[PDB]
Design an enzyme around this catalytic site. Sequence first.
Site, PDB file in Angstrom:
ATOM      1  N   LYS A 127      23.685 -41.553 -33.976  1.00 33.42           N
ATOM      2  CA  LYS A 127      23.412 -40.817 -32.736  1.00 33.42           C
ATOM      3  C   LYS A 127      23.103 -39.316 -32.995  1.00 33.42           C
ATOM      4  O   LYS A 127      22.592 -38.618 -32.108  1.00 33.42           O
ATOM      5  CB  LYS A 127      24.571 -40.990 -31.762  1.00 33.42           C
ATOM      6  CG  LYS A 127      24.705 -42.449 -31.248  1.00 33.42           C
ATOM      7  CD  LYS A 127      25.874 -42.633 -30.296  1.00 33.42           C
ATOM      8  CE  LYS A 127      26.098 -44.059 -29.791  1.00 33.42           C
ATOM      9  NZ  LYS A 127      25.141 -44.468 -28.714  1.00 33.42           N
ATOM     10  N   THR A 146      21.899 -46.183 -22.465  1.00 33.43           N
ATOM     11  CA  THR A 146      21.982 -46.190 -21.011  1.00 33.43           C
ATOM     12  C   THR A 146      22.380 -44.831 -20.433  1.00 33.43           C
ATOM     13  O   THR A 146      22.023 -44.513 -19.295  1.00 33.43           O
ATOM     14  CB  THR A 146      22.989 -47.244 -20.488  1.00 33.43           C
ATOM     15  OG1 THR A 146      24.225 -47.077 -21.179  1.00 33.43           O
ATOM     16  CG2 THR A 146      22.460 -48.632 -20.712  1.00 33.43           C
ATOM     17  N   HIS A 172      22.439 -56.635 -29.014  1.00 35.00           N
ATOM     18  CA  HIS A 172      22.550 -55.227 -28.615  1.00 35.00           C
ATOM     19  C   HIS A 172      22.505 -54.244 -29.789  1.00 35.00           C
ATOM     20  O   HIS A 172      22.760 -53.072 -29.593  1.00 35.00           O
ATOM     21  CB  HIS A 172      23.870 -54.979 -27.862  1.00 35.00           C
ATOM     22  CG  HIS A 172      24.028 -55.764 -26.612  1.00 35.00           C
ATOM     23  ND1 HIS A 172      23.766 -55.236 -25.369  1.00 35.00           N
ATOM     24  CD2 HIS A 172      24.446 -57.040 -26.407  1.00 35.00           C
ATOM     25  CE1 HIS A 172      24.027 -56.151 -24.448  1.00 35.00           C
ATOM     26  NE2 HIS A 172      24.439 -57.254 -25.052  1.00 35.00           N
ATOM     27  N   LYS A 221      21.078 -42.565 -16.917  1.00 37.00           N
ATOM     28  CA  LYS A 221      21.969 -41.863 -15.983  1.00 37.00           C
ATOM     29  C   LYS A 221      21.525 -40.416 -15.787  1.00 37.00           C
ATOM     30  O   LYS A 221      21.540 -39.903 -14.664  1.00 37.00           O
ATOM     31  CB  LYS A 221      23.417 -41.890 -16.489  1.00 37.00           C
ATOM     32  CG  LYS A 221      24.011 -43.296 -16.661  1.00 37.00           C
ATOM     33  CD  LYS A 221      25.349 -43.254 -17.391  1.00 37.00           C
ATOM     34  CE  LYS A 221      25.697 -44.607 -17.958  1.00 37.00           C
ATOM     35  NZ  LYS A 221      26.913 -44.518 -18.758  1.00 37.00           N
ATOM     36  N   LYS A 277      28.345 -39.246 -25.517  1.00 34.92           N
ATOM     37  CA  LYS A 277      28.198 -40.582 -26.073  1.00 34.92           C
ATOM     38  C   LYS A 277      29.212 -40.682 -27.209  1.00 34.92           C
ATOM     39  O   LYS A 277      29.749 -39.664 -27.667  1.00 34.92           O
ATOM     40  CB  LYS A 277      26.782 -40.874 -26.590  1.00 34.92           C
ATOM     41  CG  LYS A 277      26.233 -39.840 -27.557  1.00 34.92           C
ATOM     42  CD  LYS A 277      24.740 -39.990 -27.890  1.00 34.92           C
ATOM     43  CE  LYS A 277      23.802 -39.589 -26.752  1.00 34.92           C
ATOM     44  NZ  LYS A 277      23.031 -40.753 -26.263  1.00 34.92           N
TER      45      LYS A 277
HETATM   46  O1  LIG Z   1      35.123 -54.266 -33.246  1.00 37.46           O
HETATM   47  C1  LIG Z   1      34.105 -54.817 -33.691  1.00 37.46           C
HETATM   48  O2  LIG Z   1      34.113 -55.645 -34.626  1.00 37.46           O
HETATM   49  C2  LIG Z   1      32.758 -54.463 -33.082  1.00 37.46           C
HETATM   50  C3  LIG Z   1      31.564 -54.856 -33.747  1.00 37.46           C
HETATM   51  C4  LIG Z   1      30.340 -54.526 -33.240  1.00 37.46           C
HETATM   52  C5  LIG Z   1      30.225 -53.831 -32.015  1.00 37.46           C
HETATM   53  C6  LIG Z   1      28.970 -53.512 -31.463  1.00 37.46           C
HETATM   54  C7  LIG Z   1      28.866 -52.844 -30.273  1.00 37.46           C
HETATM   55  C8  LIG Z   1      27.547 -52.526 -29.720  1.00 37.46           C
HETATM   56  N1  LIG Z   1      26.414 -53.059 -30.118  1.00 37.46           N
HETATM   57  N2  LIG Z   1      25.399 -52.486 -29.370  1.00 37.46           N
HETATM   58  C9  LIG Z   1      25.948 -51.615 -28.531  1.00 37.46           C
HETATM   59  C10 LIG Z   1      25.203 -50.781 -27.531  1.00 37.46           C
HETATM   60  O3  LIG Z   1      24.834 -51.626 -26.435  1.00 37.46           O
HETATM   61  C11 LIG Z   1      24.204 -50.905 -25.356  1.00 37.46           C
HETATM   62  C12 LIG Z   1      23.958 -51.899 -24.249  1.00 37.46           C
HETATM   63  O4  LIG Z   1      22.883 -52.790 -24.531  1.00 37.46           O
HETATM   64  C13 LIG Z   1      22.916 -50.226 -25.861  1.00 37.46           C
HETATM   65  O5  LIG Z   1      22.365 -49.428 -24.813  1.00 37.46           O
HETATM   66  C14 LIG Z   1      23.193 -49.361 -27.076  1.00 37.46           C
HETATM   67  O6  LIG Z   1      21.954 -48.881 -27.597  1.00 37.46           O
HETATM   68  C15 LIG Z   1      23.954 -50.147 -28.146  1.00 37.46           C
HETATM   69  O7  LIG Z   1      24.340 -49.298 -29.238  1.00 37.46           O
HETATM   70  N3  LIG Z   1      27.293 -51.609 -28.752  1.00 37.46           N
HETATM   71  C16 LIG Z   1      30.024 -52.467 -29.582  1.00 37.46           C
HETATM   72  C17 LIG Z   1      31.262 -52.739 -30.103  1.00 37.46           C
HETATM   73  C18 LIG Z   1      31.403 -53.442 -31.323  1.00 37.46           C
HETATM   74  C19 LIG Z   1      32.670 -53.769 -31.894  1.00 37.46           C
HETATM   75  C1  LIG Z   2      26.781 -44.739 -20.141  1.00 36.45           C
HETATM   76  C2  LIG Z   2      27.999 -44.488 -20.971  1.00 36.45           C
HETATM   77  C3  LIG Z   2      27.942 -44.674 -22.426  1.00 36.45           C
HETATM   78  C4  LIG Z   2      26.654 -45.024 -23.130  1.00 36.45           C
HETATM   79  O1  LIG Z   2      25.941 -43.792 -23.379  1.00 36.45           O
HETATM   80  P1  LIG Z   2      24.769 -43.794 -24.506  1.00 36.45           P
HETATM   81  O2  LIG Z   2      24.325 -42.346 -24.481  1.00 36.45           O
HETATM   82  O3  LIG Z   2      23.745 -44.791 -24.036  1.00 36.45           O
HETATM   83  O4  LIG Z   2      25.442 -44.176 -25.795  1.00 36.45           O
HETATM   84  C5  LIG Z   2      29.094 -44.417 -23.163  1.00 36.45           C
HETATM   85  N1  LIG Z   2      30.263 -44.061 -22.589  1.00 36.45           N
HETATM   86  C6  LIG Z   2      30.424 -43.864 -21.275  1.00 36.45           C
HETATM   87  C7  LIG Z   2      31.766 -43.480 -20.715  1.00 36.45           C
HETATM   88  C8  LIG Z   2      29.307 -44.106 -20.373  1.00 36.45           C
HETATM   89  O5  LIG Z   2      29.402 -43.964 -19.023  1.00 36.45           O
END
Ligand SMILES: O=C(O)c1ccc2cc(-c3n[nH]c([C@@H]4O[C@H](CO)[C@@H](O)[C@H](O)[C@H]4O)n3)ccc2c1
Ligand SMILES: *Cc1c(COP(=O)(O)O)cnc(C)c1O
Lengths: 810, 810
Positions: A548, A650, A351, A654, A542
């Site tokens: 971003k 995502t 992701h 929406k 977001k």
């Molecule tokens: O606490 C941590 O160590 C840690 C590390 C990496 C992390 C990465 C994420 C993370 N990676 N990608 C994402 C998000 O996943 C969404 C669903 O596919 C994507 O639409 C979005 O573009 C992406 O940034 N979140 C979230 C929490 C995390 C927490």
């Molecule tokens: C959909 C959603 C996100 C993800 O939004 P992005 O613009 O894709 O980063 C984050 N937080 C909440 C509460 C959401 O519903």
Amino acid sequence: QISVRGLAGVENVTELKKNFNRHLHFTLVKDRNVATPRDYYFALAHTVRDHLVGRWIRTQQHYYEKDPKRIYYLSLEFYMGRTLQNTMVNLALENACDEATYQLGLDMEELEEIEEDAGLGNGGLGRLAACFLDSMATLGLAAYGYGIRYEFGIFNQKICGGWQMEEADDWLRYGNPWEKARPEFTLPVHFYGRVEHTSQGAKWVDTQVVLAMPYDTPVPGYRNNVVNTMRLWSAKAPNDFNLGYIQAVLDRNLAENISRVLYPNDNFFEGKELRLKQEYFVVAATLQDIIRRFKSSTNFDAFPDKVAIQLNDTHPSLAIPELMRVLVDLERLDWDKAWEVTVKTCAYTNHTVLPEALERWPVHLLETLLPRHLQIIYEINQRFLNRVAAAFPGDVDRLRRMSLVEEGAVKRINMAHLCIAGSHAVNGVARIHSEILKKTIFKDFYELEPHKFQNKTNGITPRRWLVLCNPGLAEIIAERIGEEYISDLDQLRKLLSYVDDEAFIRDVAKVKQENKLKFAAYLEREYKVHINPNSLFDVQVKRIHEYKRQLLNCLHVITLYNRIKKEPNKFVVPRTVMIGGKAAPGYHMAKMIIKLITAIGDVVNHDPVVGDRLRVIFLENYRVSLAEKVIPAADLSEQISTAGTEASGTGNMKFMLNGALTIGTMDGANVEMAEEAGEENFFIFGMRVEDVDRLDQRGYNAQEYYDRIPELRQIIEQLSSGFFSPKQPDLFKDIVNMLMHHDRFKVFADYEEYVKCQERVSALYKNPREWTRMVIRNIATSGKFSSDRTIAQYAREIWGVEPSRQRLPA
Amino acid sequence: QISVRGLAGVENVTELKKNFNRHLHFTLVKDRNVATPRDYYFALAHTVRDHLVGRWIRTQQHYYEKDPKRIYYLSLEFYMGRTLQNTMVNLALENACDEATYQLGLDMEELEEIEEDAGLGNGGLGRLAACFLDSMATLGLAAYGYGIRYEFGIFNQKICGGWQMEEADDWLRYGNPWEKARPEFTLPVHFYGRVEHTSQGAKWVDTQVVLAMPYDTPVPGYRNNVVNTMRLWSAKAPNDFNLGYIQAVLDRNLAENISRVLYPNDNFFEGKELRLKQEYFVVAATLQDIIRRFKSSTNFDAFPDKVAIQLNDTHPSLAIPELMRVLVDLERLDWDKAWEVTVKTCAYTNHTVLPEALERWPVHLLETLLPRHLQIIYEINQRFLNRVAAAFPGDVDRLRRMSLVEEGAVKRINMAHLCIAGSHAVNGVARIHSEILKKTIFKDFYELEPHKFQNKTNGITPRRWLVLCNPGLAEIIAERIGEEYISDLDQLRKLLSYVDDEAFIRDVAKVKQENKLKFAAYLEREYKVHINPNSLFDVQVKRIHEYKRQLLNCLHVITLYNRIKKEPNKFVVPRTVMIGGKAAPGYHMAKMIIKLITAIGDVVNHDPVVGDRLRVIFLENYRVSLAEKVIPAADLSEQISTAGTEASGTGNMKFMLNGALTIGTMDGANVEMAEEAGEENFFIFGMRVEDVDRLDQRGYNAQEYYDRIPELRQIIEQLSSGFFSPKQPDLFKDIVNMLMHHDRFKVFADYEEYVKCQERVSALYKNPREWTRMVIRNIATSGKFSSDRTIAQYAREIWGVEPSRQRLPA
Ligand SMILES: O=C(O)c1ccc2cc(-c3n[nH]c([C@@H]4O[C@H](CO)[C@@H](O)[C@H](O)[C@H]4O)n3)ccc2c1
Ligand SMILES: *Cc1c(COP(=O)(O)O)cnc(C)c1O
Ligand SMILES: O=C(O)c1ccc2cc(-c3n[nH]c([C@@H]4O[C@H](CO)[C@@H](O)[C@H](O)[C@H]4O)n3)ccc2c1
Ligand SMILES: *Cc1c(COP(=O)(O)O)cnc(C)c1O
């Protein structure tokens, strides 16, 4: 009232009223004289819950009897939001409950607002897991979500003096009527210890034990009578734990802290021991539960025919060595057979490509906490690199790049490399992202095993993100094309035949206007702020992160302010600019960005020359329930990440479904949205991925943009000199210094094109008929972005199971 | 089946069956195929709970409308045991539930055994509070019990290698269906801070806040449709507590530890800061709740007409200065008026004279934790001593003896002195104890204010302690004299007319024999031990403490063993000697006593020459649910505390009601039991209080008894030389040294009379007809020891309210 909310038959309404009163009396122990609004909410929730349980029991019995392949979706986050309205929607009870409560003298919308969000995620990743559970149930898959029941979810954000303050999200304080504790399926999880090698093989001994107690939450499909399970584990000390006496009992808290709190990072790897314990805890409990269910129908050859495990990023990557441990150490399979089973069972979804988000755990941590898992990882690595060396003889640098073990001052395990080695499928989450994986960060792996690499473009559930949050839009669509689109979103294409229909154009615009008025009134009541509802609602919601580019939006807002001040008596299209999102508590620059946004608001909103032509509002405590209110009200969706950084997004989807136009870069799923709608129906600007690469090769010099663009130079001078912080002139120096000398995300490089593109948005907004026609072209082509489409692809192309729209009996 | 268990009408049975199935399906989310016995227990508990709630709501509405004087019983302990059977008894549902469950293919007695004891007390004090709540509801008093909802109650005792091991009592693990959380009545409690003096008076500022969240449990009266409330407070951190981020959330545990665990001391004051926090927590939350309820009908002159607060020992003594604080600092009453209200509202019950049990808190602790309360205590003291000096001019030693402040290396507050000064009534808990209070420890106070001092002899509820635990005895009594005795225990006197009735004699003996067989079978199944059920069951169950003299019983057991070994072929009346009870974890000598008892058992139980003539069993994990099994099975009740040390005792009363004869000293309520039954129907032995005083004046020399009694000398030589610990010859040296040189409780001084008295017990047991006639004379005169009698006396003589046996409507 409205058709998509279902029937309110006299018998159903009578029955709901009687059960409501029964729960008020027997469950809550109140009468109407002493009952609070919160009591009425609980009485309704228990009443609706009763309609789930028969279906839940029957669904799980059906899976026991038919024994289909089971899908296990492993995630550290499930960002569920509220459950009451979603349950009513999926069971076709919304109109009946509205009538029943109305007859009892209660307003159901008021009762809905009492429910706490289940905030067990950070943002997009956690919310994707929630949409996916909804789609799996709607498509009749025997699917289970497995995670952790955090006592405290994502923090509640307060703004004090323009700064983010965090407070604990004590979401379980009043009880959670949706879950059911299952203390009878409590399982042990082991930590620390050491490995002994006998003639019987390896034994992991002298461990500390924590118990994993499951809590089950129902997940209803859309009007198909399927109710699946989300099982979340809670940490409990054993009763002999530390067993002077009083201190031993108090110290049980050390074990139970594993499930206490969600780490509030989005795209940032912190590397804390407690997080590693959380990751193992969820994996170890889940895998035992999986194996128990498999045995309760010796022969692990059939395991991958009956089980699929989907890893949501690398956070549950320890499932790979844990599965090996169980099969080799406990079931006594030979290594090669165990590995075949593991690879065929596991699949990995990536992701993110941001380097700071990738999990790389220090070896010394794993050695102490999970000594047997480290041994298994080393053996996986040695066998994997043996294959690499045979395929690319003499390519010694490839061996070091592909190793699961990274050398350095501190040796680390690269968890993404482990996931690729131990999974039969690896996917990204939008076409551009999946291509980036194959061309850059996982290029070496793609060359060894090209067949593993796939794309699965993300999606959102149209139940929560259209029917639930925007019933007026759902209704005017249904009046033309029926209700089938709710579970087959491709049918929205039929709306292209109405793009020149004056009645449909009017209705689309009316629904937006109603949603804007409703949101403007929400802002006055809950937050004492006044906005012009005829203004263009320009929305960026977001998580706050440099990638971003909330800062790019800030630069545009200041530009518009400066242009008004320069020519006060010229007409400009009025805007309300709304920015919201949480910053991770340790992320200093993200916290400074929040402060900048509120500081701009303080100047702009109180300048009498501006009037109601420009307002800047920071939306506090952005979360799933606030998204449901603001997204239907938006005119313009800001999706402005630097090309190559937002893996999918995502929120973008929406907004498209709910009648906003998009201003965005060619990043993540924005590319595919533009492709579906037509580039002429999207406000695209800025560097493509290839242009970012070309700038990186020459070297990004922000000074060049400063020197050439007078409007940009004025803004930087205003920031530096204290125009937006008169009491503290140097408050924003860190922001200026970052933009000028250390900007990884190239904010100035897209400034000119962004401002020009924003001028085109304004021009179109002045012609309401043509704005609305473009909106229709976006809503009509949003069908691809249903999570039902996404899940059908995972099912056929990864899990090897066929979706079904057939209804179980009621 | 049996009449005292109520009617099993066809309509009631049908309705219970349908509700049972409803709860199994909707509440527990199970069907009959996957349901465990624990699920069936919960389905029954929810079914019975439903019958309470209508009555609970109506009772509390009735008190709101009539506005009677309310009685608040404040205790740190409520030793409730199990609730299911007690609820059925009090609602007349037992036979109906038995039939309903039988028709569903389930055994209700098996389901009853699944329920956890609510073990929120240590022994007699906590159990007295529970009996009192039952009697207050049965007598129609508007009464509330207020305490703490400990997460962990009294520890579960395991015996390993003959030693006590403790494990945590995780009683809430599976849920508690009886309680209802009331998060809406959550109140703040303050700690630390400092006092500021303004022109408006004193202000307590800069405090740390902990929230008190109430959980309510229903308390049903006996067949009168009254359901009162027990409100227990749980500690919660506020959401901004400590608000890097993660550590702040984890540190919420520091505040929440207040309600985590019951201190496991019986008659021993430890003086820990956490205990002081518990004491204030319960007082502060309770008093706010009391005041809120009083205002919701300025004029605090009527407060003592509407409120009585009963202090269960000094543990909630801070209620006195807290009430003063609220009235003076917050309501702005003048000191003298506030004091008048406080004294008229509060009353104090003393439950012990042992010096090590009296609470004396260091001033430095109070100064840090509760600085305003310390100031108020000093002012109370200065005003109180001013009165003493006026009444006894020049008596300077009296001033120092009566002071609330004790001088020394560390200054302390004597909490008992505070309770006497601030209460309109002070009572002991048996006639001899109340007399001791007036003659010794509170003599000075009695001379100043003789009118304050009262007696209220303790009692036990005949619902739990006859009808519930011994239905066969309840039934044979009811066959002769009807059912009215269950709420009017004095009617048992009518059984004196049956002392020469051959049928009644037979039936009394048959019921005892049945209870013995049932208990002997319980011991085989749960603990793999075999006993002769024709043997005399000689039982001492109570907490392990030097004053209770389990060691004197041990000396008798060894005496009987040595006598058998000396003359193996002589007949002796067979005995099963059963000793059980928990030791406080830090009380070394109590733990050594347990080890001695099991070590004696190891020798006696495996000596082939003894055979089944003597068995010694240590009953593990003694608690309320085990008391309900063993007490009905007992022949001989051991109540052998040193005269002057057991303030009342209540186990003594339980055994008397259930057909055991008593061997005991003239201590506590034993004196009154002997008076009621006739001394000829009691096995009385040993020093009276006056004889103990005479020995103390001359000086107790244990060596004299050793020198003069050959049988005693043999036992001490056996202990010293390792006869009972052959692998560790010196294991019992601490016990021998204590008995010979440092015995505060004069074990050797009562040895000769005890052994001789035990010989008389044996002689009577050989004549079953005469044994049983004596038993009848004891059961028949046990009426005085009903807690209904006790509570009626508190009501009339202390609280100023009239009891009522009238039924509320159903
Ligand atoms: O606490 C941590 O160590 C840690 C590390 C990496 C992390 C990465 C994420 C993370 N990676 N990608 C994402 C998000 O996943 C969404 C669903 O596919 C994507 O639409 C979005 O573009 C992406 O940034 N979140 C979230 C929490 C995390 C927490
Ligand atoms: C959909 C959603 C996100 C993800 O939004 P992005 O613009 O894709 O980063 C984050 N937080 C909440 C509460 C959401 O519903
Ligand atoms: O933990 C502590 O600090 C502490 C201190 C003193 C304590 C005293 C007691 C205590 N005092 N009296 C009692 C008991 O109260 C019963 C009911 O009236 C009497 O029948 C019994 O004779 C008496 O010993 N228990 C209990 C727990 C304690 C805990
Ligand atoms: C009644 C009872 C006590 C008190 O017994 P005494 O012999 O009066 O000390 C202690 N524990 C339990 C479990 C009880 O039921």
